[PDB]
Design a protein around this ligand. Structure first.
Ligand code: HEM
Length: 449
């Protein structure tokens, strides 16, 4: 079979299609036009975009395909280096850090983070309780305050104190700037052109901001049993080695970025979907009131918020906040019985499209219906992949979900929410997705913390 490909622009091939602020959403539209697979060419470059569970289940076979660093991740590697998310599977430092850091996400570790998560969640609830009449909430802004502070405190015993600031923590400003530059490089025809000299300067200036904080965090610890403890002291069972200093710095950067951005997106989409679906919101609120009987939630109570977990999964179905991942063929292989691939050939999994596979989910795929997840085991293998695949899946998945469940439960216990502007969904794309400009009003239910 000869594979579909979107419209081309002479020698630029398909490249100009990605000259947009919303590339994933563009690609989703192309996926709608062309189906389960399409070829995407740029000068000197080719990838194939996959949207169907039928094809993605083969792509997820680790014997045939391994994680690739997309062009995005390759640019992120300029500051994240050989940290876990931007390492190749065959780099010694991937498997070492993987073995060393996985215990930071054990059941006992998670129970250990719970009190610190509550610290930040209480800060968020207090902020909202303290608003005056008619004042409104900037949802993604506040969710980022929460998620950054949570990873900072839980992972590193470091307090970004984001609820003490009216604008983002400097770290975030540079992170966003650096990630935007990393994206802008995709289009650039002549990267070494003096025209971009200033962009390299601001890039390195933003990386420098990020690295200064990393030094602060490591300094402060020199003067806990968290992530950082494991980075500094943990030994890999296989090699018997610990991480070296250079790799440790990369992990810190990696975890500070990965550990907050997608989770803030998730919480924001979840609240967006709730205020757009009032019956669902009522059911979630009812669970929160029924389960969260104490002034502050326990770890076990969070685990009992079944419906809230369903709501979070349905939000990840529709808008998985890290919306793509890239694979390469380990050897020559045939995809789907129809698409021959050679060793090294690249694939991109367009996760929001996978999650709209009508053969898997039914015809109603645009509807927000958390009951799809009544029994998560009912979902076929490789049909729901918001956390990636296999040994290269999200290490922090349970952390994200615990924090998100705890926080949304508390939000639903303590406040009624109003979509006072009838917000029109506008999805901004950076490393991740978020509903830009999303605002609500919260009316306190006046329940003490
Ligand atoms: C809703 C929240 C999150 C989503 C949707 C998400 C999504 C993903 C996805 C799709 C991948 C695979 C990327 C690829 O294949 O290139 C991944 C990997 C990763 N994520 Fe998450 N993530 C989330 C939260 C977190 C959190 C809270 C942490 C840290 C506490 C974290 C740390 C990482 C790391 C270190 C990797 C690379 C793991 C490895 O390859 O060894 N993520 N994430």
């Amino acid at each position: 079979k000869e594979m579909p490909q979107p419209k081309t622009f002479g020698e630029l091939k398909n490249l100009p299609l990605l000259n947009t602020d919303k590339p994933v959403q563009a690609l989703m539209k192309i996926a709608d036009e062309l189906g389960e697979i399409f070829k995407f060419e740029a000068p000197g470059r080719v990838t194939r975009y996959l949207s169907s569970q039928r094809l993605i289940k083969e792509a997820c076979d680790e014997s045939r395909f391994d994680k690739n660093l997309s062009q995005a991740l390759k640019f992120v590697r300029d500051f994240a280096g050989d940290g876990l998310a931007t390492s190749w599977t065959h780099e010694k430092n991937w498997k070492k850090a993987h073995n060393i850091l996985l215990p930071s996400f054990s059941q006992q570790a998670m129970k250990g983070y719970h009190a610190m998560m509550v610290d930040i969640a209480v800060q968020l609830v207090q902020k909202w309780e303290r608003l005056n009449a008619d004042e409104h909430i900037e949802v993604p802004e506040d969710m980022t305050r929460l998620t950054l502070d949570t990873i900072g405190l839980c992972g590193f015993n470091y307090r970004f104190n984001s609820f003490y600031r009216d604008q983002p923590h400097p770290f975030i400003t540079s992170m966003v700037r650096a990630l935007d530059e990393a994206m802008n490089k995709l289009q650039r025809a002549n990267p070494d052109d003096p025209a971009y000299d200033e962009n390299k300067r601001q890039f390195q200036e933003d990386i420098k901001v990020m690295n200064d904080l990393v030094d602060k965090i490591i300094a402060d610890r020199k003067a806990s049993d968290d992530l950082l403890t494991h980075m500094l002291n943990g030994k890999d069972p296989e090699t018997g080695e610990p991480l070296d200093d250079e790799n440790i710095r990369y992990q810190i950067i990696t975890f500070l970025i990965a550990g907050h951005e997608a989770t803030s997106g998730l919480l924001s989409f979840a609240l967006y979907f709730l205020v757009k679906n009032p019956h669902v919101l009522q059911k979630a609120a009812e669970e929160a009131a029924r389960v969260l009987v104490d002034p502050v939630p326990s770890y076990k109570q969070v685990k009992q918020l079944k419906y809230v977990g369903m709501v979070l999964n349905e939000a990840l179905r529709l808008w998985p906040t890290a919306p793509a991942f890239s694979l390469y063929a380990k050897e020559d292989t045939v995809l789907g019985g129809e698409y021959p691939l050679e060793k090294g050939d690249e694939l991109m999994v367009l996760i929001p499209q996978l999650h709209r596979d009508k053969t898997i989910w039914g015809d109603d795929v645009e509807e927000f219906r958390p009951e799809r997840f009544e029994n998560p085991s009912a979902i076929p293998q490789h049909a729901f992949k918001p956390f990636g695949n296999g040994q290269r899946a999200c290490i922090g998945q349970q952390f994200a979900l615990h924090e998100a469940t705890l926080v949304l439960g508390m939000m639903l216990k303590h406040f009624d929410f109003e979509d006072h502007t009838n917000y029109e969904l506008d999805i901004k794309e950076t490393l991740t997705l978020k509903p830009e400009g999303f605002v609500v009003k919260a009316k306190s239910k006046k329940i003490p913390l």
